[PDB]
Every structure is written in structure tokens, then in C-alpha cells.
């Protein structure tokens, strides 16, 4: 699930105190629910958020 991936990343960012990445994961989720981003672009966003989280 793209949604489950983004929720897990949001919580990992909350655990790291990474407030920008919290917002990006949270808002990709909101955009996906609103139909403002495609599922494929949300999945790619999750992958990028994960990369930035590791840095």
C-alpha cells in the first residue's frame, strides 16, 4: 500500500524530529486522498522521502 508506506514514513520522521519530512509525508497522503497527486507519483514521493530521511 502506498498509503501504508507514507504513514510509516511520517511516523519515522516524527520519531526523528524531522518536521519538514513529517509535513511532506502527511501532505502527500492528503493530496492522494483529494486526487491532487497520482498513485504512482505518491509512491515515488514515498521513495524520495525515505531517501531524505536516511540523511
Numbering used by the authors: 1 to 55
Please share excerpts from the published article on this structure.
Unlike antibodies, the designed proteins are soluble when expressed in E. coli at high levels and are thermostable, and hence could form the basis for a next generation of lower cost protein therapeutics.
